Design a protein around this motif. Sequence first.
Motif, PDB file in Angstrom:
ATOM      1  N   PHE A 133       0.881  -1.541   0.132  1.00  0.00           N
ATOM      2  CA  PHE A 133      -0.570  -0.065  -0.539  1.00  0.00           C
ATOM      3  C   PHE A 133       0.731   1.688   0.189  1.00  0.00           C
ATOM      4  O   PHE A 133       1.874   1.044   0.711  1.00  0.00           O
ATOM      5  N   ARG A 134       0.616   2.354  -0.421  1.00  0.00           N
ATOM      6  CA  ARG A 134       1.149   3.976  -0.524  1.00  0.00           C
ATOM      7  C   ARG A 134       0.533   4.940   0.454  1.00  0.00           C
ATOM      8  O   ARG A 134      -0.604   4.566  -0.104  1.00  0.00           O
ATOM      9  N   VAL A 135       0.935   5.118   1.006  1.00  0.00           N
ATOM     10  CA  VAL A 135       0.149   6.505   1.644  1.00  0.00           C
ATOM     11  C   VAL A 135       1.402   7.955   0.960  1.00  0.00           C
ATOM     12  O   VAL A 135       2.360   7.736   0.509  1.00  0.00           O
ATOM     13  N   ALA A 180      13.676   7.036  -2.393  1.00  0.00           N
ATOM     14  CA  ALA A 180      13.894   8.045  -1.323  1.00  0.00           C
ATOM     15  C   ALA A 180      13.517   9.374  -2.098  1.00  0.00           C
ATOM     16  O   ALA A 180      13.387  10.246  -1.837  1.00  0.00           O
ATOM     17  N   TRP A 181      13.394   9.306  -2.955  1.00  0.00           N
ATOM     18  CA  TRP A 181      13.200  10.921  -4.064  1.00  0.00           C
ATOM     19  C   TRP A 181      11.330   9.857  -4.921  1.00  0.00           C
ATOM     20  O   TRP A 181      10.995  11.068  -5.272  1.00  0.00           O
ATOM     21  N   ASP A 182      10.586   9.335  -3.870  1.00  0.00           N
ATOM     22  CA  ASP A 182       9.499   9.199  -4.692  1.00  0.00           C
ATOM     23  C   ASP A 182       8.542   9.884  -3.142  1.00  0.00           C
ATOM     24  O   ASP A 182       8.456  10.206  -2.411  1.00  0.00           O
ATOM     25  N   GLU A 183       7.369  10.388  -4.401  1.00  0.00           N
ATOM     26  CA  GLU A 183       6.669  12.169  -3.987  1.00  0.00           C
ATOM     27  C   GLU A 183       5.640  10.327  -2.852  1.00  0.00           C
ATOM     28  O   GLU A 183       5.118  12.147  -1.634  1.00  0.00           O
ATOM     29  N   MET A 230      16.686  -0.976  -5.081  1.00  0.00           N
ATOM     30  CA  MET A 230      16.629  -1.697  -6.705  1.00  0.00           C
ATOM     31  C   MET A 230      16.251  -0.086  -7.778  1.00  0.00           C
ATOM     32  O   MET A 230      16.298   0.294  -8.644  1.00  0.00           O
ATOM     33  N   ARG A 231      15.357   0.965  -7.071  1.00  0.00           N
ATOM     34  CA  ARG A 231      15.022   2.119  -7.619  1.00  0.00           C
ATOM     35  C   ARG A 231      15.725   3.049  -7.710  1.00  0.00           C
ATOM     36  O   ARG A 231      15.283   4.393  -7.350  1.00  0.00           O
ATOM     37  N   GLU A 232      16.608   3.486  -6.781  1.00  0.00           N
ATOM     38  CA  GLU A 232      17.116   3.867  -5.972  1.00  0.00           C
ATOM     39  C   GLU A 232      18.259   4.850  -6.700  1.00  0.00           C
ATOM     40  O   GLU A 232      19.518   3.980  -7.362  1.00  0.00           O
ATOM     41  N   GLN A 289       7.163  -8.031 -10.957  1.00  0.00           N
ATOM     42  CA  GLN A 289       6.692  -7.136 -11.154  1.00  0.00           C
ATOM     43  C   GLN A 289       7.546  -5.633 -10.791  1.00  0.00           C
ATOM     44  O   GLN A 289       7.569  -4.774 -12.679  1.00  0.00           O
ATOM     45  N   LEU A 290       7.860  -5.143 -10.212  1.00  0.00           N
ATOM     46  CA  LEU A 290       8.934  -4.310 -10.168  1.00  0.00           C
ATOM     47  C   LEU A 290      10.118  -4.312 -10.603  1.00  0.00           C
ATOM     48  O   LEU A 290      10.019  -3.321 -11.594  1.00  0.00           O
ATOM     49  N   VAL A 291      11.199  -5.320 -11.028  1.00  0.00           N
ATOM     50  CA  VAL A 291      11.872  -5.827 -11.264  1.00  0.00           C
ATOM     51  C   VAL A 291      11.250  -5.299 -13.307  1.00  0.00           C
ATOM     52  O   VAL A 291      12.605  -4.920 -13.843  1.00  0.00           O
ATOM     53  N   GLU A 292      10.340  -5.987 -12.981  1.00  0.00           N
ATOM     54  CA  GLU A 292      10.353  -6.185 -15.157  1.00  0.00           C
ATOM     55  C   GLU A 292       9.575  -4.621 -15.226  1.00  0.00           C
ATOM     56  O   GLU A 292       9.994  -3.762 -16.419  1.00  0.00           O
ATOM     57  N   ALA A 293       9.261  -3.824 -14.626  1.00  0.00           N
ATOM     58  CA  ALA A 293       8.769  -2.478 -14.485  1.00  0.00           C
ATOM     59  C   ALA A 293       9.958  -1.412 -15.177  1.00  0.00           C
ATOM     60  O   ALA A 293      10.307  -0.173 -15.475  1.00  0.00           O
ATOM     61  N   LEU A 294      10.986  -1.740 -13.771  1.00  0.00           N
ATOM     62  CA  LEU A 294      12.288  -1.126 -14.029  1.00  0.00           C
ATOM     63  C   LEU A 294      13.159  -1.924 -16.116  1.00  0.00           C
ATOM     64  O   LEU A 294      13.352  -0.664 -16.374  1.00  0.00           O
ATOM     65  N   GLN A 295      13.408  -2.472 -16.099  1.00  0.00           N
ATOM     66  CA  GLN A 295      13.817  -2.850 -16.759  1.00  0.00           C
ATOM     67  C   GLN A 295      13.127  -2.783 -17.882  1.00  0.00           C
ATOM     68  O   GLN A 295      13.558  -2.622 -19.256  1.00  0.00           O
ATOM     69  N   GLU A 296      11.867  -2.443 -18.208  1.00  0.00           N
ATOM     70  CA  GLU A 296      11.325  -1.888 -19.190  1.00  0.00           C
ATOM     71  C   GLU A 296      10.756  -0.576 -19.184  1.00  0.00           C
ATOM     72  O   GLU A 296       9.661  -0.186 -20.555  1.00  0.00           O
ATOM     73  N   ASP A 297      11.561   0.294 -18.760  1.00  0.00           N
ATOM     74  CA  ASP A 297      11.066   1.636 -18.783  1.00  0.00           C
ATOM     75  C   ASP A 297      11.476   2.282 -19.646  1.00  0.00           C
ATOM     76  O   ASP A 297      12.826   1.747 -20.101  1.00  0.00           O
ATOM     77  N   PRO A 298      10.895   2.837 -20.852  1.00  0.00           N
ATOM     78  CA  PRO A 298      11.328   3.245 -22.390  1.00  0.00           C
ATOM     79  C   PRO A 298      12.733   4.482 -22.066  1.00  0.00           C
ATOM     80  O   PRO A 298      13.393   4.227 -22.606  1.00  0.00           O
ATOM     81  N   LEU A 299      12.562   4.796 -20.748  1.00  0.00           N
ATOM     82  CA  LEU A 299      14.084   5.375 -20.461  1.00  0.00           C
ATOM     83  C   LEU A 299      14.533   5.353 -19.951  1.00  0.00           C
ATOM     84  O   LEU A 299      15.899   5.566 -20.854  1.00  0.00           O
ATOM     85  N   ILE A 300      14.616   4.758 -18.682  1.00  0.00           N
ATOM     86  CA  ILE A 300      15.717   4.191 -18.276  1.00  0.00           C
ATOM     87  C   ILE A 300      16.097   2.810 -18.181  1.00  0.00           C
ATOM     88  O   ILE A 300      16.348   1.489 -17.212  1.00  0.00           O
ATOM     89  N   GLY A 301      14.797   1.975 -19.147  1.00  0.00           N
ATOM     90  CA  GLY A 301      14.737   0.910 -19.143  1.00  0.00           C
ATOM     91  C   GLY A 301      16.462  -0.281 -19.801  1.00  0.00           C
ATOM     92  O   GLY A 301      16.952  -1.417 -18.991  1.00  0.00           O
TER      93      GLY A 301
HETATM   94  C1  LIG Z   1      10.801   7.597 -14.393  1.00  0.00           C
HETATM   95  C2  LIG Z   1      10.190   6.432 -13.918  1.00  0.00           C
HETATM   96  C3  LIG Z   1      11.158   5.428 -12.945  1.00  0.00           C
HETATM   97  C4  LIG Z   1      11.943   3.996 -13.147  1.00  0.00           C
HETATM   98  C5  LIG Z   1      10.274   3.249 -12.741  1.00  0.00           C
HETATM   99  C6  LIG Z   1      10.088   1.963 -12.707  1.00  0.00           C
HETATM  100  C7  LIG Z   1       9.775   1.969 -11.424  1.00  0.00           C
HETATM  101  S1  LIG Z   1       7.970   1.119 -10.828  1.00  0.00           S
HETATM  102  C8  LIG Z   1       7.371   2.407 -10.359  1.00  0.00           C
HETATM  103  O1  LIG Z   1       8.336   3.117  -9.510  1.00  0.00           O
HETATM  104  C9  LIG Z   1       7.538   4.063  -8.592  1.00  0.00           C
HETATM  105  C10 LIG Z   1       8.667   4.207  -8.160  1.00  0.00           C
HETATM  106  O2  LIG Z   1       8.921   3.826  -6.612  1.00  0.00           O
HETATM  107  C11 LIG Z   1       6.434   4.060  -8.262  1.00  0.00           C
HETATM  108  O3  LIG Z   1       6.190   5.724  -8.099  1.00  0.00           O
HETATM  109  C12 LIG Z   1       5.386   3.603  -9.277  1.00  0.00           C
HETATM  110  O4  LIG Z   1       4.300   3.040  -9.033  1.00  0.00           O
HETATM  111  C13 LIG Z   1       5.463   1.959 -10.508  1.00  0.00           C
HETATM  112  O5  LIG Z   1       5.418   1.736 -10.975  1.00  0.00           O
END
Ligand SMILES: CCCCCCCS[C@@H]1O[C@H](CO)[C@@H](O)[C@H](O)[C@H]1O
Length: 257
Positions: free
Chosen positions: A19-21, A57-60, A124-126, A153-165
């Motif tokens: 969950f996110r807060v 740490a940078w996430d709003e 992994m998102r730092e 899914q997290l690892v997947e979303a990272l390795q696939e992002d249009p910018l930093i994939g």
């Molecule tokens: C400009 C996007 C930078 C890299 C994103 C791939 C990770 S996935 C992404 O991560 C964000 C930060 O934790 C979350 O706010 C978002 O909901 C989540 O889907």
Amino acid sequence: PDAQTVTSVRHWTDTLFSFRVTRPQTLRFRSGEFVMIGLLDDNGKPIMRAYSIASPAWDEELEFYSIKVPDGPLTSRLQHIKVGEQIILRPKPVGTLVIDALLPGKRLWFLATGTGIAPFASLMREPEAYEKFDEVIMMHACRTVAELEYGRQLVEALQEDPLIGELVEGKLKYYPTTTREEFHHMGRITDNLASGKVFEDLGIAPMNPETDRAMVCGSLAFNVDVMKVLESYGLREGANSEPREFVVEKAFVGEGI
Ligand SMILES: CCCCCCCS[C@@H]1O[C@H](CO)[C@@H](O)[C@H](O)[C@H]1O
Ligand SMILES: Cc1cc2nc3c(=O)[nH]c(=O)nc-3n(C[C@H](O)[C@H](O)[C@H](O)COP(=O)(O)OP(=O)(O)OC[C@H]3O[C@@H](n4cnc5c(N)ncnc54)[C@H](O)[C@@H]3O)c2cc1C
Ligand SMILES: NC(=O)c1ccc[n+]([C@@H]2O[C@H](COP(=O)([O-])OP(=O)(O)OC[C@H]3O[C@@H](n4cnc5c(N)ncnc54)[C@H](OP(=O)(O)O)[C@@H]3O)[C@@H](O)[C@H]2O)c1
């Protein structure tokens, strides 16, 4: 006390949810640290528990990956949390799972079991993880495949992002395994590091003190076994004060579940 509002909720299994807060405007932390969060019990008294901030740490916003223990004072309640409701979130970030607590090196290992991947969902998102190291190895071992989903899914979303994939795809090595269900890669992190199997599956050199740094996060028993294995490769436990090759943090306290 300090109240924050739940913005989104996702249940992964009958025993796992995230969950996110909203984030306290004053909060400043280092990816990997944890804070105390909680709910009021039936008598209006705080039920506090430490939780790794799963978001970078940078996430709003702030994200948490949580277990669901039936009869668990806090999670038996928290598992019913809904968007709009609130939780107690004390902005006093601490913890040893931080890059600054490790001597610079070239290869960073995140060794986790169960919910212990929470602080790594953060790291992994730092940006700093990819700046200070050439490779980042994420070993996540669970009993069943479904428990790996949040991390997958997290690892997947990272390795696939249009910018930093392409960027991440080149430095992040994701190594998930199960120990109780059939999966393409199985076995405990301890066994697979000790036998050398992970080095072979990933096509990389064995662990060495000069280039490898690791962060450990799982049950106490797991933490102690991984330490010996790491030490078997010449690595030494460090400290934020005296940085070395590895650091550890309990994913939880107690027996199992
Ligand atoms: C400009 C996007 C930078 C890299 C994103 C791939 C990770 S996935 C992404 O991560 C964000 C930060 O934790 C979350 O706010 C978002 O909901 C989540 O889907
Ligand atoms: C540094 C630190 C960081 C932690 N970070 C997280 C985190 O990010 N996410 C998370 O879910 N928990 C985390 N934990 C555990 C967390 O603090 C609480 O124990 C959890 O919220 C369960 O609370 P409870 O009151 O429902 O059950 P509790 O009474 O606390 O525990 C009952 C039993 O459930 C088991 N248990 C508790 N938490 C877990 C878990 N995470 N995974 C597997 N078994 C568990 C243990 O055997 C425990 O004795 C962390 C613990 C520490 C010490
Ligand atoms: N009193 C009891 O006899 C009792 C009490 C509670 C739970 N349990 C049993 O334990 C299971 C729940 O899982 P668990 O606590 O064993 O795993 P766990 O800490 O909850 O975390 C998940 C993973 O870490 C691994 N792991 C556990 N100990 C390890 C170690 N010392 N070194 C390296 N990796 C380790 C587990 O692999 P492995 O699957 O090989 O562990 C599993 O893949 C249940 O199936 C239940 O049947 C027994």
